[PDB]
RNA sequence: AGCGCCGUGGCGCAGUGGAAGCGCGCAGGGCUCAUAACCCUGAUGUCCUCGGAUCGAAACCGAGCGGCGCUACCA
RNA sequence: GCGCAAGACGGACCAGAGCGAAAGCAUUUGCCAAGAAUGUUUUCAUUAAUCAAGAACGAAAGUCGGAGGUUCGAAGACGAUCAGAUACCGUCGUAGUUCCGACCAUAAACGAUGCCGACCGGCGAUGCGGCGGCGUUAUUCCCAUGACCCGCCGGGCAGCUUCCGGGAAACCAAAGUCUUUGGGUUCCGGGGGGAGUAUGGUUGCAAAGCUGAAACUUAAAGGAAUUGACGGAAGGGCACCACC
RNA sequence: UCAGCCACCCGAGAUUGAGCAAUAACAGGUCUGUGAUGCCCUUAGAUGUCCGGGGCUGCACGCGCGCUACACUGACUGGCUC
RNA sequence: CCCCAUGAACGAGGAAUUCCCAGUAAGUGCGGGUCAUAAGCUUGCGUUGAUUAAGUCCCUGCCCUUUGUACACACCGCCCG
């Protein structure tokens, strides 16, 4: 149902009667355990919205939502739970275990064929045609799909397993899953001087500096938590801080002085996100070189690191006996190397190349590429040089200057968040507009000449290398 | 304009009523 | 695994055979004291490659390349 | 086009008209209690004017419970305009708009003019009651009564007019009877900002309300009217260096 | 029935074309027209002058007045009269 | 300046816009200024001699009346976060 990315026509807030009818229909569908958990999933004091979708095929889908969580969805007909709602409450639907070979295709949105469910790893309990069910696997403990039976279980087992057993309505990592949401001096001086000296020694615990003891007593925090140490010096045997500074200074721990203002100053005796990204270079094998890589197992389109290209070329120069006898630094070129890595003027000229030259030529003949690992995710492979975030200044309207920022998404930056942050930093009007070329690519437009603040944002806040940013010299100031 | 800085004053005052709570 | 659709200006696209244009963009200018828009002028490509038809073509045959979509997918 | 249902709202008649302490108040019919003015050769015999404390009502929005959800509709979501519009335009649309029951006590709640009383130029109008008066009408004569018509009297909403006098002037028959300064009384202002903010107190479920500073800052801020210049205001007017 | 406006007649003529041009102003052009000037600079290898050459005239480009034409009511060739 | 040759762009001109109401536009030649030799410029002069209007504020520009104004170095003004 959701296998394609689908937009939203509208969102409707539901009145009390329609709300009650909807819950009555959920209670009828599921067991009455639904109702017992509804009060949790659908609180009466919270807003209840229905999200109206238009499919690419012209189908009107509705996704029932309270508190941001998609709960159930329907087409014209009975309500179905989202895979996330079902992961929390698995007992609201009958379950069916499927063979492994089906799994991959089950997460491709494909219907569940009959033969998948009687092969020995699969299992098949008793359900009628039209009933809603959770699709499960042996090696996986959560429902990978939501589907409806097109045939009763008996008929499935019996028929010789031909035709569609279960229509797959919902699956893991479809668009509905990707949306995922809609919009006593002993004790007291021991504790005190322990945690207080330890908070007089490291950093931000201050090492050795002249500083007020008060500031330190009210400094109970280390690493964004309190030490749980809260104590007032009034709990000590010292009715004044001057006496505490008389004792603590006597122990070869602190030294003492009084400021002219009257504070007591002591000089101690010394006794949610990240900004992680990963970038690696890659080399793609063009057609012209395929022969050279035939022995390595790599064909046209294969992505290789530099180390692999060096190992493959070295292995190719050793296996074909191309290494010169009297010089082990030279490689005699056979017809394949001569064809792929040599120019037209060198075609019959150069009979031999050193390892440096051969490896550099082989690396330059390959198509440039790169791989970006943005943590939490699988590597994404791209063709060409790593594209730098592009900052451009344009003169528009009448004497109105605009700053445009491009290729943010290449680095995994959301154009909207960045537009907001820039709106607060620069304090002007920001917008997010479609960008030239590509397909869906976004650019961020700030009203003014802001580039120094982009310097602050990118170089300081996000700690991106200077080599990944372009056009910073046209800036008003270095920032 | 008057109406709006009266409004702004009430915003600010609500915020101050939050930042200083009788728990402080 | 296939079928279609594509592979024509910088950017998107037309083109029902003598054989390249439309719109935006870009260099200019007219209107206003002047610029911006607004108007008017300059210009802008082996038509995916390979081989073939065709008196002779992006327009027609196939071999493919990629990428789009489209599927329907018996995995 | 025919019927049905629901909830809102009472068009035109409607006015510088009426009624109310003010908010406010227009379909018919009945029921319930008030109320001003008028009429009076009725009764009581100073019972009266104004009001700290304290009490009653108090538009809209807002808040709690309930019912109800047609229209409109903050929030939100799109579509446009735009250099940019999270805005004016447009489609959708939550709270609310409606009724019942509890809170809130604030509006440019404005006649920006406290209340009681006395005096001071006219003139037409109007609303309500009374008094008087030819004449018309409800058909033809008698009285009632009603409709017009001509006046007089007392309250009202207003109007026009004026060298009454005020007033900084706009304007005002009250803002008049003020250096020729005293009829009674309540509230209340003291250059502009800072600020109706801070704090304490107090009322509230909450939003807020009432009471309410100082440090500092500053030569003006302001009100009427007068000539200008300008306006994307409304009028006229010209010119073949404007057009036809 | 007032200014004046329209038609016609009598007539050379029922509209001849320029010059001069007010109270005011502009921070318009004018040290380069003045033996008309307030300042500043230059003043004897002169920003002075005279002598001899070059240059204001230069050329991938825009914008302006103006000339000449794109022909048959014309170009050429002779002839006649203002 | 004059004689021969050379003989090219130019096919009534896009958006826009200038000047003009009767001896007038327009064609045409002439005199003065500048000038030792010089008018594709200017300033005057006649000659040939009309088409269309005798109207209007649409455009543009300025004048007057009423009106609003927090402007008066006067909208290229003042001014708010």
UniProtKB/Swiss-Prot annotation, chain A:
Protein keywords: Acetylation, Cytoplasm, Initiation factor, Phosphoprotein, Protein biosynthesis
Residue stretches making up the SUI1 domain: 389-462
Limits of the PUA domain: 93-173
Keyword Cell membrane: no
Alphabetical list of SMART domains matching this protein: PUA
One GO term of the biological process aspect: IRES-dependent viral translational initiation
GO MF annotation terms: RNA binding; signaling receptor activity; translation initiation factor activity
Family per similarity comment: Belongs to the eIF2D family.
Modified positions (N-acetylmethionine) in chain numbering: 1
Function according to Swiss-Prot or TrEMBL: Translation initiation factor that is able to deliver tRNA to the P-site of the eukaryotic ribosome in a GTP-independent manner. The binding of Met-tRNA(I) occurs after the AUG codon finds its position in the P-site of 40S ribosomes, the situation that takes place during initiation complex formation on some specific RNAs. Its activity in tRNA binding with 40S subunits does not require the presence of the aminoacyl moiety. Possesses the unique ability to deliver non-Met (elongator) tRNAs into the P-site of the 40S subunit.
The name this protein goes by in its record: Eukaryotic translation initiation factor 2D
CDD domains: eIF2D_C, eIF2D_N, PUA_eIF2d-like
Family matches, as PANTHER family: EUKARYOTIC TRANSLATION INITIATION FACTOR 2D
Location of the SWIB/MDM2 domain: 281-365
Source species of the chain: Homo sapiens (Human)
Location(s), subcellular: Cytoplasm
Gene Ontology CC annotations of this record: cytoplasm; cytosol; nuclear body
């Amino acid at each position: 149902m959701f296998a394609k990315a689908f937009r939203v026509k509208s969102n409707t807030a539901i009145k009390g009667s329609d709300r009650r009818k909807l819950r009555a229909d959920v209670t009828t569908a599921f067991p009455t355990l639904g109702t017992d958990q509804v009060s949790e999933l659908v609180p009466g004091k919270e807003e209840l919205n229905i999200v109206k979708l238009y499919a690419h095929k012209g189908d009107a889908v509705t996704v029932y939502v309270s508190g941001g969580n998609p709960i159930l969805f329907e087409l014209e007909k009975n309500l179905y739970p989202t895979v996330y709602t079902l992961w929390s409450y698995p007992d609201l639907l009958p379950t069916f275990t499927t063979w492994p070979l089906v799994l991959e295709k089950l997460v491709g949105g494909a219907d569940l064929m009959l033969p998948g469910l009687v092969m020995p790893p699969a299992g098949l309990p008793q359900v009628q045609k039209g009933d809603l069910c959770a699709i499960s696997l042996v090696g996986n403990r959560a429902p990978v799909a939501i589907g409806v039976a097109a045939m009763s279980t008996a008929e499935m087992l019996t028929s010789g397993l031909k035709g569609r057993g279960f229509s797959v309505l919902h699956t893991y990592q479809d668009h509905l899953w990707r949306s995922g949401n809609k919009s006593l001096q002993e004790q007291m001086d021991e504790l005190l001087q322990q945690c207080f000296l330890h908070a007089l020694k490291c950093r931000v615990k201050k090492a050795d500096l002249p500083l007020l003891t008060s500031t330190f007593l009210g400094s109970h925090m280390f690493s964004c938590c309190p030490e749980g140490r809260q104590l007032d010096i009034k709990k000590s045997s010292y009715k004044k801080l001057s006496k505490f500074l008389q004792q603590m200074q006597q122990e070869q721990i602190i030294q003492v002085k009084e400021l002219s203002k009257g504070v007591e100053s002591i000089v101690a005796v010394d006794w949610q996100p990240y900004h992680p990204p990963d970038i690696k270079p890659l080399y793609c094998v063009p057609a012209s070189m395929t022969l050279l890589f035939q022995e390595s197992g790599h064909k046209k389109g294969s992505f290789l690191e530099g180390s692999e290209v060096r190992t493959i070329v070295i292995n190719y120069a050793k296996k074909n006996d191309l290494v010169d006898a009297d010089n082990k630094n030279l490689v005699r070129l056979d017809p394949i190397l001569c064809d792929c890595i040599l120019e037209k003027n060198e075609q019959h000229t150069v009979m031999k190349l050193p390892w440096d030259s051969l490896l550099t030529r082989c690396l330059e003949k390959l198509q440039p590429a790169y791989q970006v690992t943005l943590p939490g995710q699988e590597p994404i492979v791209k063709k060409g040089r790593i594209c730098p975030i592009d900052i451009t200044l344009a003169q528009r309207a009448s004497n109105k200057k605009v700053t445009v920022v491009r290729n943010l998404e290449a680095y995994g930056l959301d154009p909207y968040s960045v537009a907001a942050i820039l709106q607060q930093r620069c304090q002007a009007s920001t917008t997010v507009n479609p960008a030239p070329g590509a397909k869906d690519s976004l650019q961020v437009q700030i009203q003014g000449n802001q580039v120094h603040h982009l310097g602050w944002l990118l170089l300081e806040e996000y700690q991106l290398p200077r080599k990944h940013i372009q056009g910073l010299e046209k800036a008003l100031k270095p920032g | 304009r008057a109406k709006w800085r009266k409004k702004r004053m009430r915003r600010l005052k609500r915020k101050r009523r939050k930042m200083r709570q009788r728990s402080k």
